[PDB]
Amino acid sequence: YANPALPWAWXXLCG
Amino acid sequence: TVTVPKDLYVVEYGSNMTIECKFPVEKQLDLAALIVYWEMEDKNIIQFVHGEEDLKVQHSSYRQRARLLKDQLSLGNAALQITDVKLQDAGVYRCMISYGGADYKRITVKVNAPY
């Protein structure tokens, strides 16, 4: 988060 | 605050659904201030950043079925449309809107198979 090209995880985490 | 008109959808197998997720917009939407996240049980559906989206991060099970409706977005409705709804689409969907502050709601989707 909040790079649109990287997976996120809930909430506002990097995945 | 993010609000939902409803927090439970019961939608027919094979139909199209639009899940809504409202946030306050003034005279016009400012893309430079807006981030939208739609997620479902660790699957990333929409990761919209200031207008930018990348299909590569969409979970495989939503490819070509799930999109954020941009006309609605412009009205303060970050509406997730999922076409050809599958039984596996049932579950808890989470929306996060960041737009002059961050908030979120959870929405349950159930899928029926009428006969």
Numbering used by the authors:
A (entry chain B): 1 to 15
B (entry chain A): 20 to 134
Give verbatim lines from the article.
A key target in this area is a protein-protein interaction (PPI) between programmed cell death 1 (PD-1) and its ligand, PD-L1. Functionally, PD-1 is an immune checkpoint molecule located mainly on T cells. In particular, PD-L1 expressed on cancer cells inhibits the killing of tumor cells by T cells. Besides PD-L1 binding to PD-1, previous studies have shown another ligand of PD-L1, CD80, which upon binding in a Cis mode provides complex cross-relation between PD-1, CTLA-4, and CD28 pathways.
High-quality crystals were obtained for pAC65 in complex with PD-L1 that allowed solving the structure at the 1.1 Å resolution. The asymmetric unit of the pAC65/PD-L1 complex contains one molecule of PD-L1 and one molecule of the pAC65 peptide. The interaction between pAC65 and PD-L1 occurs on the plane of the PD-L1 β-sheet composed of strands G, F, C, and C’, as indicated by the canonical Ig designations depicted in Additional file 8: Fig. S6. The peptide ring assumes an ellipse-like shape with a bulge located above the central region and binds parallelly to the plane of the β-sheet. The backbone of the macrocyclic ring extends itself from the 65Ala-NH25 to 65TrpNAc10 while the bulge is formed by 65Tyr1, 65NMeNle12, 65Leu13, and 65Scc14 (the subscript 65 indicates the macrocyclic peptide pAC65). The binding interface of the peptide includes hydrophobic interactions located at the center of the interaction area strengthened by polar contacts at the rim of the binding site. Two indole moieties of 65Trp8 and 65TrpNAc10 occupy major hydrophobic clefts at the surface of PD-L1 and create the T-shaped stacking interactions with Tyr56 and Tyr123, respectively. Although 65TrpNAc10 binds within a prominently hydrophobic cleft, the acetic acid moiety of 65TrpNAc10 extends the cleft towards Arg125 and Arg113 providing crucial salt bridges with the side chains of these amino acids. The structural characterization of the PD-L1/pAC65 complex showed that one molecule of the macrocyclic peptide is bound to a single PD-L1 unit, similarly to other macrocycles and antibodies targeting PD-L1, but unlike small molecules that induce dimerization of this target protein. The pAC65 peptide dose-dependently dissociated the PD-1/PD-L1 complex with an IC50 value of 1.80 ± 0.16 nM, a 40-fold increase in inhibition compared to the activity of the previously published precursor – p57 (IC50 45.4 ± 0.001 nM).
